[PDB]
Design a protein around this ligand. Sequence first.
Ligand SMILES: [Zn+2]
Ligand SMILES: [Zn+2]
Lengths: 138, 137, 5, 5
Amino acid sequence: TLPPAWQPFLKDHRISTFKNWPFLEGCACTPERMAEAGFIHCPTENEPDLAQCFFCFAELEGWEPDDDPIEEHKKHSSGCAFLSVKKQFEELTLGEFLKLDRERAKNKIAKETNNKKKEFEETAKKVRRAIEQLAAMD
Amino acid sequence: TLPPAWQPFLKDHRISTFKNWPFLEGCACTPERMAEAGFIHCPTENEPDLAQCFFCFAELEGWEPDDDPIEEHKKHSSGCAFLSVKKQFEELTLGEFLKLDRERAKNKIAKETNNKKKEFEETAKKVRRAIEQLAAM
Amino acid sequence: ARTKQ
Amino acid sequence: ARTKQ
Ligand SMILES: [Zn+2]
Ligand SMILES: [Zn+2]
């Protein structure tokens, strides 16, 4: 009875996204530990082990059994505030929670911005190339 | 922002429900004060001033300018836990908030049960009258 | 104020 | 583990 947009804030929800995750008992990066670090399982045909931080939207693959997810998160997304959250969900005040959800909405946008830029820059290289090639014959 | 089911927990949402409310500046039961007491404006063609507690679902009409909504709420729904909430929304913990929302869900159901009882009792009066009338025939 | 009926 | 590229 919590809205789905907010479910990823819940460890138990995040764990639940790991269904056919290969690293189970014996491994350091189990679902419990991936979830405690912020990750959601976002697998694809092409990258079966893709994990995404629900908060900062960093995406990491190439997991190995000894990998500590908290350590990998710090290594590859040093700025993610979720890593600073020491309190349990239910111990957060609504003010804190709302402060956190604004930050996530800003992170999401930074991420979409950063993608749109890269796609644009790629498109621009192709057009530039095309016009150079045409100018090259005259 | 916040899901529609939860907006009524917000004072400013509640105030905003008072679109055509007659008691304004000067009066004790203004929108600010109705909202602080828990009420939402649930007017109808038939009862223009109907207010409802979003938390306990008590419904009160016949408002008058000197009515203090908190005092009216205590008088007509003494057990409503929202009246106990001393803290501001944002100072509540999620645990407290979730405890509160469960209570409201129970209140809603208690209230729907109570309405269905009233409808049944009314239907039973009509059937009774009908049979009386026909037993005479 | 008073209850609906 | 490393970043998508
Ligand atoms: Zn993160
Ligand atoms: Zn109430």
